Every structure is written in structure tokens, then in C-alpha cells.
């Protein structure tokens, strides 16, 4: 942890004023006025245009099941499901049911590469070079290449709004840790190598 | 009609047979419906599979065999298929369908169309979103996911159809429908949209490169009665013809009012009374200028669910010199009905 | 075959795939029954519901698929709905049912209408009384309300239909029917007259302002053995057309004699002879004419009430050089059948 | 679905609602598929009556309505019998039936016919032995009379169809095929020949007192998967049309390959890649000519047995010069399949 | 009971009990019911009594009864389409509340409202009349079906009807010839079954 | 003792027929019958011919008065022709069992039902048992339909076939009759026992 100084400050600006003061008011209203039918309607759709991604993906890390069961999501939830809103696959197969996405960033951590220093930047949160940044591989072909730059910080906002609120409940859970810092690059680093692995 | 029902797939096999004459003034070229027999038969499924505890999966098709035409060159007459369209239903999520079915401005013009053998003037086929239309897409949702109980809505989308004549063809589209029912009222209205064809517009008849089509309904049924009205407004979408000049096209605008009052009598008769009065505007050459208007008063005996047989008598009050050729007779129908 | 029974309402829904097939001199031109291909299906439902202890609602619905055509632009060729009625049927007291259905002079032309494939050629499709027609209105009783056992009758109401051509039109008419059966043994004679139509008042051949047909049979039906033989007369309603001056119509006259003669051997097979002559006369520029003249030798055998196969050869006695153009040559037709 | 099984007779009624989308650039008519709404249905019933422990007979029609038209004047247009015949099937002497049914070299072209739309571009319709035709008797025995198991043949004579276009007409003729099937690989071979018309004789393209189709495949067909490439040559009987010179007829010789390769996932997901290519020869002031050119990528999701949906993907591998005319912008169809 | 003109019509109902019935329509009666078989006596007198189901539908609504207004409107709309012009009940067949009934026509709407009947008068060959009811109830021959009806089909009506009517009494034909005054109780029948239809 | 007035000549030709025409001749040709031709093709090939006669039998049922028979024949043939593949199959049999194949019953047989007799019983090289009545006066079949459409290769070749299979199926009780003490008064009283029943 190299830039563990820089990281500390910029996660002390996140955690204390631009969460409790912006990002956590921002979720909370979402929490209560947006209904339920169109929350998870939201995430259905703004994920959806991952799926060819993960398929590539996955067909890059040589699991061709695995690639064509995301293709699979894609072909019945952008026809039959209304593009991407509904989840008829999941209602149809439970092997269809959706998990969280592998996407170039896995392919690289797959095939051995590592990240770098763990970053934390303000208002984005946190940042590795392997994942982040090298997950944009995915947005050189079809379905998050025919995004415009206004729709990808809608989707980074739409879905950054949606993760926030589904978080409410453990809210105190790392402001009741002697170092909330060192618990929050522990679960990122969590997460982002079971994914890879 | 339920004939097949094992492993979650289920197949409804449903028709009829109706004997039907009109009666009407001389050759009947002057009527509301014109003259003679006009017996069909009518036979469809409707398949419907429960793939599991979210996923119904359906599919229907539905075709209109003719009664009244001979064995010869005239055999096919009329016959048509009137609905053919797949589907699926999500758990409280809705439904998903297409093909040819109805258009979604029905979802409010249903509200009137209840006559025994008429009515319903407005619910044109072929006719962008009022009824049956080939090659629409349809999400549908009821009880607003399973919150909102008693609302129901529906949007709906028109491919572009470009066929020989103008009267059938149509662009690409857009529409859709909300209403809300509870405890024997309803209300709903519903409106769509769409490109013309370049033939629709060379057309004599009518100006506009988007046609427009909304309607708006109340019913209540309950308690043996129904009493039911529908207004509505068309720009370049209803289909007119004018009899003298012998050219085609639309009505540039149409102000739509229908209302229908019925009773359900214990004892097995159910009359029926109806208005209906259908005015165009800024029609080419003519201005204003009615396309429907009539009284109906009708009553259908019901022998029992598969048994039927009604009359049917339109006052037409059309005018006697009609500047678009609407027949000015009356028009009244006697049918008998088996279905199943 | 009955597929659906439940709720006091029964459906049967059957049907035949017959594959057929023509053998007749060259390209079967002047062949009683042509040449070639002959292959149809045949699909329809009868429906028939309980409403109570006197009354029974019924309709019914029959269509014919012709087998013969390709997938192309001839593929309607043949298609036709045959019937298409509902009606109701009163404890002793009759049954009435409207709708295109037999008309009435077929209670007596059926007696010898039992031949394989063919036969029965007084029998015409859209032509008065003597076959299918559409708008007819039939009241029947059978043993006369409950009194005389055997004895049936049936009166029939002909609604005008103005056709496109002559040839499948009619006007206005009414016709009756009564036969008396006891053990064995069938009489039955039959009456109908309409209007012509002012298009077929226009065509070359036949003249009169009023059609008619009527005709008469003897039948024995018993011990595996059938004997039957019709006797009838038209005026204005057989359809005539000459082959040389290319003209259709009516013949003025016609005298028409069936006979039929069948054997049912217990191993299966149900042979028949036939002999059917129709000579028409009063014909615009020819004078008298035959129409029909054959005997026949056939045979059918019968595997089970599902599956049969039959031969039917027309000895066509018709002359080289019949004036109106009647073909002269032989037909034999060789078919199998799977029927539900 | 069986909707009948009692005493000695079972009755499948069957049938299909399509929900089907062509993407096609443009208008689609330089397309492989075409532009727009494709939906149709399918209707038929399959019967078989059990005679006796040796004789089976059985009938068999299905129709095909399409969804795609108005209830206009075009009702109509592309409404068509595909199949209606009837036979026998004997111990094991084997099977005869005779009516519209498919051709003998389907026997061999079937095994690549496995597409989620598309494929199949050899196996026309009317067209001699290679797809759908009418008036055709066959003789098929399965295992050898019992004796070799897994060793098929069948034997079929086509009577002439003189029609009215050159495209669905042919003259007498005879084929066969052999099947050999032995765990999970099959090789079929089959070859037929027949007359052909007059008129087809006096057509610009095309020029042979003699039609001539063979075809031969291997598949394995195993294990969730399926693979099979089919080879066949014609003489004289590929119809072509010349889109500039507004001239139809057929291919003096044509070579035909096809490829398919398709898996079965466990979670319901049919991927499909498959091949095809059919280059003309000997074409009149043209020479050798593509007709059917591509790569396919397509997939179908299996709900259950009655529902379905695929995307169908021609990466239309066809030239912008083709000297015949054929349209080669790719097609991608959407599908949704209710069946039953 | 009033009866103002009892004088006259107990000679003019004699007329018709001792003479005009035993010489003339009670011999009728008894050819018919001889001859006539029953289903022809059942198709007539449902056919006959189909020609007043229209105007016993208009009469029932002017007294604010719909319901049973819209009875008999069933009864004329199933019966002549379907029943072969009236001859055959099917309306009675289909429904028990349709059942064939005593015909209310404009007599009862009269009475209804208040009417009385004045005096009972007693015509020959006539029988029994009132004002109010008989003759006043042909007021619904001023409109359709019964407007159709000429003079000749209107006695022929009523006299097919009543050979109907005395066929079927004559088994109680006779019970009355032995009681004391029978002037009185086809008198008070009149009223009983006049009263009955009125309420 | 039966009465045989060409009991010479036949004794004679018969010898040719029993130990040189058939050991050197007939009887190889029948073992490759049965060593290569499959079943299905043989039993598909007696129904085959047998059919070409079925007409014939029902028009010499109809003159020995049994048109409950003649039109059993009938049924045969119209059965096995159309559906049964031109009498490959046999579809009448496997039908009813009363339309079981069964022996012919032609012209010889009709003459003989009306009581006609044989003539001499004669024995012909090549040919086997002859006599005027049965053979070749079943030719009179010859001159009407079916058999009337026969070529003389056709016909030759009918016999030739039919009569192979014959001789295949007596292969295995071909030593019965090389140990019989006189075997051409066996093979000849095996003709008239046969043929007496056909007639009778
Ligand atoms: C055009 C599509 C090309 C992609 C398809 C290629 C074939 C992929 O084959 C993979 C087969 O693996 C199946 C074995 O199943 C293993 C996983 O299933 C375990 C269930 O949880
Ligand atoms: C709720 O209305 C939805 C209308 O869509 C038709 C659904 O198709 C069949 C599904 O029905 C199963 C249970 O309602
Ligand atoms: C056809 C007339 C419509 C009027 C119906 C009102 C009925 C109310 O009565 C209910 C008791
Ligand atoms: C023209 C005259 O005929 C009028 C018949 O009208 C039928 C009555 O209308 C139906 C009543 O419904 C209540
Ligand atoms: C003129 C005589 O023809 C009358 C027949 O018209 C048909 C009317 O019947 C309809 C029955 O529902
Ligand atoms: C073309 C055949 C028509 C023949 C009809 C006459 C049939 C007579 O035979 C009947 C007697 O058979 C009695 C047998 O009982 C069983
Ligand atoms: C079980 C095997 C299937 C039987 C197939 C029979 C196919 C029939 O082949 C007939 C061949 O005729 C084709 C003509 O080819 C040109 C030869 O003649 C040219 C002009 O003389
Ligand atoms: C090139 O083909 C020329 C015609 O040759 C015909 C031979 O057909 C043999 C087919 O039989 C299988
Ligand atoms: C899509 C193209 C289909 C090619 C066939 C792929 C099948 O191979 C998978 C075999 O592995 C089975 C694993 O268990
Ligand atoms: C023989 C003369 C023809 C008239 C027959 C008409 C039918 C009569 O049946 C009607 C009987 O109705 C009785 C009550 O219905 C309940
Ligand atoms: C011509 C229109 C007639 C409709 C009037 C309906 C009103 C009648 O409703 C009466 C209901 O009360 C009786 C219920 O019986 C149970
Ligand atoms: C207007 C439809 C009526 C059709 C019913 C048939 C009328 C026949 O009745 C004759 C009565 O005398
Ligand atoms: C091309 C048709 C081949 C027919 C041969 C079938 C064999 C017939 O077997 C009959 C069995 O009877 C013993
Ligand atoms: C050419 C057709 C002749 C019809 C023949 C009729 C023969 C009927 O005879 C039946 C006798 O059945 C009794 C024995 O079983
Ligand atoms: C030229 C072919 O003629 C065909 C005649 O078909 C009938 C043959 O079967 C008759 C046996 O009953
Ligand atoms: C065109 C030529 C057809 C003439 C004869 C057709 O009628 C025969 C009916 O039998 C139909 C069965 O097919 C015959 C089987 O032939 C195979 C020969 O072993
Ligand atoms: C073609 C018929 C030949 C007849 C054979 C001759 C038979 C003569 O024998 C006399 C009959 O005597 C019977 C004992
Ligand atoms: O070919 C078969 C017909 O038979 C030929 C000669 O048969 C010899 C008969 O006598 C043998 C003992």
C-alpha cells in the first residue's frame, strides 16, 4: 500500500463529508421515493448492457458455459424481458440467476496480472488499475460501446445511487471499527479476487 | 374448449357458429350494415403452459371462416385470421407478447363495445392502434406490480407495416393505456401515435405525416347492469371513403362519443341501448361531416353459457345527403349463436 | 371425434385425410371426373349442447382443405367452408336451424348419393334445394310431433344470395321434405322453387323468372344390403355450360334418374353398381342434351370405422359428340382414408 | 397435443403461434430474409388407428395461417396446406401413404435442417423430391423387414403436377433413399429424377427433358450435440429467378453443401453455427452464380416443450454483383414459439 | 254484488247458455276436440296468443313493472324467430319465469290505475263483456302486431280461441248445469278472474 | 387302381424329370434360392405372382356360383395391389383373416366343378404333370385381364420363378421320395389328391 497517506486522506473526505453530507442524503431519497418495481427495474437494465462483456469475458478466460449462460441473460432479457428491465432469465433457470459481473478486469487477474497500489479517490471512492481501468477494455465493443459519455456517468450514478442505499443497514457497522479505512480496502480486495479467482 | 390440460400445458380450443341475416331497405347499399346472410364460424386456440412458479408462457391464434360466401370464386371472402401471437407472463411483473393482436386505444374503446351484433364503430382493423393489428409488440402490467391494486397498464409498440393498399398500411408507432377499477367502476384512457406510409399520404383523403388516435372510458358493471361511454379524438387515423368522388383516404379529424347502457335480467334476457356519433373535421373538399350516428336498441337471450340469440336494430340517424355517402337506412340483425 | 363432454355441453371435432387420386384418358379433359391429383382434407366441428330437458342447442362448422394445391399462388384453390348453422331442437316438436346447410331437395337426392367418390351429380353445391346453400332456415320434425313413427318432414326458407356470377346466385324461396321409413324400407319426396336472380335471368341459356326442383326416392336399407333410386325434375336450376360456344346458365328443363345397388360382405368389403342419367332439354340452340350418363362398378373396403380405401369406376356412356360438350371419356379414382 | 385416444384411434391436434421479426437494412428486398413482422401459425392434426396387431392406418394435415397479412383483401397470401395424406404401416413389411408430403431427398437434406429460422435453403417447396410436394406415393420399411437394425430405405413415385407456373409444376418421376443409423452417426443418401413440363421445358432458364435431385449427409446426433453436413447436386430442377432480366426458370446444375453444428446446454440455450452455399451452373448468359451463401450464428432458449424463443443471425456472405440477383444484405430474426 | 243491468243480461246470458251453446258451439267443441289433434290445437293457441305478447309487453311497462314487461318482450322475440312464428313455445321450453301467462293487455292497465268497470253486461253469442276490459282492450288493436290483424283474422282469432276455451271445459261442461243460479257465478267468475288480472 | 393310358411315355419323362433334369438342373439353381435371396424378397415375390392370378380367380368363382369367394378374390388383389405395393405386399391377410391367400381356383377348376374330367394325365419334360382339363386349360385365364396383359417372357418367367421357390421349399423332404418303392405313382397321386380338392 504505497499511496496508503494519500489513500487515507482522500477516504477521510469520502467517509466524512462527501457521503454524510452528499452521496448518503442523495441514496436515502432514493431509498423512499423511488418504488421498488423501479428500483430493481433500474439495475436490471443498466446491467444488462455488462452482459456481452462478461460473455467475452468469459470466453477470454476459457469457460465457454459460464459465457454463453451471460449471453443467454442478455438474448431473453433484452427481447422477451423489455430490454433489460425485466429478469426473465432467473425466473426461468436458477443457473441464469444473476450474479456480479467478471469483466476485463477479472480476465487480466485471471491470467495472472496484478493491480498496483490501491488507490481511493474522491468522489469515485475507491480505484485499482487492474479492475477499474481495466475493466474500460470492455467499453471498446457492442453494448457498452455504443454508450455516450453522458450515458456512462448516468449508469456510474444510477447504479452508484442503488449500492449506496443497499448499504444503510451496515452503516454503523464500519463506523463502529477502530480503523474503518483498513476494513474498506480489506472488503474491496475481498470482493475484487473472488471474482478473478 | 379447455381440451388439453397435462404437464403445465393446457390448450383451449374455442369457436362458433352464427347464423346471421340482415335485414335492411331494399339492396341494403343504403345501410348501416347492409342486407342479406352474413353467417360465419369462428375457430382459435388459446395455449397457455406454466413453466414454473413465475413463468406462464402463452400463445393464441384465432380465424373468421365465412358462412355466406358460395363454393366457387368467391370461396375465400372475407375469411381471415383475426389474432395469431405468442407470449410470456412474469409473476406479478407482467406480460410480454407478440404478433397480431389488439391494438392498445381497444383497452379503452372495450369499455363501449358490448353491442349484440354492432357498435364499436371506432375500433377499426387495420387502423394503427384501435384494433386488430399485425406486428405489435405489448407490455402489459396488472395491479402495478403487485402494489396498486386494480390498476392496470399497458404500452405498446407499432411496426411498420407497408402493404399494398393504404387503408391497411401504417409506419412505426407507439402508444399505451392506464386504468384503474375498483368495485364495479372503471375508468381508462389510452392514446398511440404513428408515421404515416408515403401511400397513406399521396392519399386525396386526409393530411398529416403522424397519425394520432386517444379515447377515454367509464363503465360500471355490477349488479346486472352495465352502463358505459367512450369519448375520443382521432387526427389523419380514422379510415374514410367517399362514395361520390370514389377516392380513398382519412378523416384529418374525427371527435368520437359512444355510450351503452344494459341490463342482465335473472331470466336470461339482456337488452341492450347505445348512441354512437362519429364526426369528422377538415375532411378534403367537405369540411365537417358525420361518419357515424344511430341509436341501437338490442336484447340477447342467453339459453345457457354455450346457447345464444339476439336482435339487433340500429336507428341510423345518419342524414339523408351525407356529404362522404354514409348509408342513411337503418340496419336491424337476427342471429342465433353456438359456441364453445 | 368427440373431445370435449363436461358442463352439459359436448364438441366433436373431425375430420379426413384423403389421398385420391384420377385415372382418365390424356390429360383427362373429357373425362367424367378429370385427371390427375385428387388428394383433400376435411376438418369441422358439431357442437351440441343440454340447456334443459326440451332444449338442445347445436351447431356446426365444416370446411374443406384441398390437398392438390402447391404452396404458391393456386394454394386457396378448392377451399371452401361447406357448412356453417346453428340452431335448436324442440322435444317433440322439431328443430330449427339457420345458416348454409343442405338444402331441403337433398332429403330425397341423398337416397343415391352413397357411391365411394362419385355419384350423387344432381346433388349441386350452390343451387337452390338440391345441395349446400347458404341463408337457409330449416324447420324439421321427425315422427310428426310424437304421432306417426317414421314419418319426418322438414320445411325450408331460401334467403337470397345476389353472387358475382349467375351460376352460384338465387332469389327468394321455400321448399319441404317428407319421408316415411318402416323397417327397412324409405320413401321420401321432396319440393323447392325460388326466384332467379336478374343475373341469371341475363345468361344465353335458360329463361324463366321462377326456378324449381323437386324429386322422389325408393330405398332399402337392411341385412347388409342397399337398394335405393331417385326420381326428380328441374326447371331453370341445373347449371349448364357449353363447352364449344363458351356460355354457362341453366337448362330449362331436366329429367334425373340414380339408381344404387351395394353389398356389405362381412370380410370387409361393401361393392356397389350404379347407373345415372340426366337428360336436360329446352336448351337455347341445342334442344335436348344429356348432362350425366354412366354406370358404375366400385367397391370399398372398410379396415376399421377409422381407416378405408375404394375404387370407383365411372363407365361414362356420354357420346363422342355431346352438343353442349359433356366429356365422353371414363374416370376411375382409387383413394385412401384415414377419417376421425 | 393427443386430444383423442379411445377404442382403436388417437388423434393429435397440434399447432403453433410464431411471434417472428426479420432486421434486414433497408426495405430487406436486397436482404436474405426480407424486412419486418414474419409471424405466422400452425395448425394440423396427426391420427393413427390401430387396425389390427399388423395394419396401422394413419392421416396426417397440417396448414400454415399466416399472421403477417390484414383481414383485407391480402387475407390470404401465404396461406397454405403444407401436408395431407394418408397410408398404411404393415408389421414389419414396412409403410405406405399416399398424398402432399414431403420428398424423398428430405430423407438426406433434413439432417442440416435444423436451424432456428433459416437453413434448410435446398429443400424447397414444390420443387421435385426436395422438400413439401403434392401427389407422391411412398413406400418406407424401417430396421430391413426386421432383419438389419437401424437400415432404412423408402421408395417414392411422383405423379405429374402440370400447373400453372412454371416453378410449382413437374412430371412423372421416382426416387429413394437409404438411411443407415448406429449410435449417434447416421449417413443417408437419396436421389430422384422426373420429367418436367412443357412449360417448364419452354422456360429461359434451364433446359433438360429430365429433373434430377440427390443429396447425401452424415450426422452425429449424440451426447447434447449435433453435427451434420449435407452434399447434393441438381439437374434442372433449383428454381432461380434473374431479379434484372425479370426471367424465372431453373439451374441447369447446381452444388449444394450445407453444414450445421449446434450444443445443448443443460440450462436451456441451443447455440447454432452453421454453413451454406449452393452455387448454379450452366446458367443461361450468365454462367456460374451463388444462390445461397452464409455463415449463421443463431440461438434458441427452451422454456419448456411448448415454449421457446431464438435469434437467428444470416451473416450473409453473398456478393453486391451477383449476376442472378440475390440480395445480400445480412438478416437477423427474432422468434418467439408458442406450440402444442 | 252491483249489477245494474242483471234484468237484461240474464235472458241475453240464456240466450247463449241454452240455446246458442248446446245447439252450436258446444257440437263445434266437440268435432274439435275430436278432430283437431293436439299438436295442431297447442301450435294455434300458442300462435294465437303470440299476437297480443307484444301488446301485454307494452301494457306491463305503463304500470312500472319492467321486469315483467320485459318477460313477455322474450316471450314474442324467442317464440317467433325461433319458434316458427309463434307456433312453438320455446320461450316456455327455455325458462320457467317465461312461462306462458294470462295475457295483460290494456284492460289491466285501465283497472290499475283506478278504473272501474261500471256495469256487467252479458252480450248474445258474445258472452261476457265489460267495458273496461273487453272492448277496452281493443285499444291494442291500434298498433302493431294486432294492427295487422283485419276484420276477418279478428273474429277469426277470438273464434278459434274460444273453440279452444270450450274444448277444454267440456269435462266441467256440465258441473255448472247443476247449481242453483249459474248467471251468478259466471258473473262472479267474470269478476274473480277480471279482479285477479287487474291486481 | 386308377387309370393311366400314357403310363409309358409318363413313366418315362418322369425319370428325366427325377434323376437328371432335376439333380443336374432344377435343383442346384433352387439351393441358390434359398442360400442368397432373402426372405422378405421370396415371400415378397410369391405374393408378388400370386397376385397376377387373383383376378382370374374371382371371374372362376363367379362361374362356380361362389361370389362370396369371388369377391374375397377381389379384395386380394385390389388390397395387395394398390396399398400393397402392385402385390408385394400382402395387406388383404394381414386385413381379414377370410382374404387369406389361398390356392387358385381357375378355368381348370371351373371346368371341373361342371364335372369335366382330365383326359390322359400325361408327364412332360421340363414341365412336370400336365393334363388337358387343369394345365393349359387354366390358359384359358390367359385371354382376359391381368394374365391377358402377361409378354411370353413374363409368363415364362412367373413359371420359372414360382416354380424355383416350389422346389426350394421341398428341399429338406426330398429324401422322402428317394425312398419310396414307386415314386412316379406317388407324384401323380399326389396331383389328382391336389388337384381333386381344388376342382371339388
Ligand atoms: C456460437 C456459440 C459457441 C459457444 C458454444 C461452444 C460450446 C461450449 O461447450 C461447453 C460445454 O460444457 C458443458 C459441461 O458442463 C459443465 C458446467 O455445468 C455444470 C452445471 O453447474
Ligand atoms: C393479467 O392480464 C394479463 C393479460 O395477458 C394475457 C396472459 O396470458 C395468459 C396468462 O394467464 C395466466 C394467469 O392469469
Ligand atoms: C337497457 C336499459 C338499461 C337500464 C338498466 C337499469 C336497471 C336498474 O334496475 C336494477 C334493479
Ligand atoms: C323495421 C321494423 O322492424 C322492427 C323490429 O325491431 C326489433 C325490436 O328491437 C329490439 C328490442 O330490443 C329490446
Ligand atoms: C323470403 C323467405 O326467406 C326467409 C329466410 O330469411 C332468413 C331469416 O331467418 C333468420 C333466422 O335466424
Ligand atoms: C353389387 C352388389 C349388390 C348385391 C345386392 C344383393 C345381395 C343379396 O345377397 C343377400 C343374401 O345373402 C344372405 C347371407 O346372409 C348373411
Ligand atoms: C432403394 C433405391 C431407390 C430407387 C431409385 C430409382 C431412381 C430412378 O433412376 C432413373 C434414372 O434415370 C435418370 C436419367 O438420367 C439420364 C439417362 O438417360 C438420359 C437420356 O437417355
Ligand atoms: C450427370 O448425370 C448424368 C445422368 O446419369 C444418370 C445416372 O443416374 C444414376 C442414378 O441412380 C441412382
Ligand atoms: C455452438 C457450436 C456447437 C459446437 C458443439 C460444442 C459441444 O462441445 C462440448 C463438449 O463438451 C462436453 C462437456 O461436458
Ligand atoms: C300438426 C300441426 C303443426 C303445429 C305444431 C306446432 C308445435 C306445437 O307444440 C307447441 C306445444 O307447446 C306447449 C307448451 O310448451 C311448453
Ligand atoms: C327496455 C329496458 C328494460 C330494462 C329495465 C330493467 C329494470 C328491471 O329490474 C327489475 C329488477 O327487480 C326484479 C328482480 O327479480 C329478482
Ligand atoms: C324474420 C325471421 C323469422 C323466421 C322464422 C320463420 C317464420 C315461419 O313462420 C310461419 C308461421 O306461419
Ligand atoms: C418395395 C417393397 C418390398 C416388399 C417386400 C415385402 C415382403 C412381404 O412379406 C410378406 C410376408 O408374408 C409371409
Ligand atoms: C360384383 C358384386 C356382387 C355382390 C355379391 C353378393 C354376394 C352376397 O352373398 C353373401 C352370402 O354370405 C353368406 C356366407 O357368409
Ligand atoms: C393407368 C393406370 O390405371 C389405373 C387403374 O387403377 C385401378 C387398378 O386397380 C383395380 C383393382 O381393383
Ligand atoms: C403414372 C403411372 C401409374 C399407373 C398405375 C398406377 O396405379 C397403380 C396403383 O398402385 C399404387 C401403388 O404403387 C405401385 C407400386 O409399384 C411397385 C411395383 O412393384
Ligand atoms: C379343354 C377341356 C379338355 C377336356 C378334357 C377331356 C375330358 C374328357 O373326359 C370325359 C369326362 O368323363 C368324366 C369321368
Ligand atoms: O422351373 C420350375 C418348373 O419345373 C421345371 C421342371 O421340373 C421337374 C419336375 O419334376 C421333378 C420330379
Known sequence: DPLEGFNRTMFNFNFNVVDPYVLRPVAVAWRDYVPQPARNGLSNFTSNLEEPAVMVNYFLQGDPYKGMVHFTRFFLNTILGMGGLIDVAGMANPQLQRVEPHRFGSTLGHYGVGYGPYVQLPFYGSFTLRDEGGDMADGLYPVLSWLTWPMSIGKWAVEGIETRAQ??????????????????????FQRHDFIAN | AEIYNKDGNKVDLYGKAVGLHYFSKGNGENSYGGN????????????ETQINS??????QWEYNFQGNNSEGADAQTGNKTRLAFAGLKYADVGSFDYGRNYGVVYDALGYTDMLPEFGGDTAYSDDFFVG?????????NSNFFGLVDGLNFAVQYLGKNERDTARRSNGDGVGGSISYEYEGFGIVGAYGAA????????????????????????????????????YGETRNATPITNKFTNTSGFANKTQDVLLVAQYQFD???????????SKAKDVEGIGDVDLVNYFEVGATYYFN?????????????????????VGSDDTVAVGIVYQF
Open chain 2, 305 to 325: 353459457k354455450n346457447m345464444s340469440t339476439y336482435v339487433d336494430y340500429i336507428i341510423n340517424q345518419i342524414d339523408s345527403d351525407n356529404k362522404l355517402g
Open chain 1, 167 to 188: 448499504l444503510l443497514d451496515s452503516d454503523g457497522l464500519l463506523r463502529q471499527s477502530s480503523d474503518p479505512y483498513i476494513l474498506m480496502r480489506e472488503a474491496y
Open chain 2, 195 to 230: 408515421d404515416r406510409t408515403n401511400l397513406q399520404e399521396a392519399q386525396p383523403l386526409g393530411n398529416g405525416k403522424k397519425a394520432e388516435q386517444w379515447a377515454t372510458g367509464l363503465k360500471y358493471d355490477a349488479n346486472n347492469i352495465y352502463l358505459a361511454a367512450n
Open chain 2, 132 to 140: 386488430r393489428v399485425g406486428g405489435v409488440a405489448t407490455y402489459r
Open chain 2, 267 to 277: 331470466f336470461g334476457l339482456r337488452p341492450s341501448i347505445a348512441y354512437t356519433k
Open chain 2, 54 to 59: 413465475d413463468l406462464t408462457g402463452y400463445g
Open chain 2, 36 to 47: 342479406g346472410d352474413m353467417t360465419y364460424a369462428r375457430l382459435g386456440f388459446k395455449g
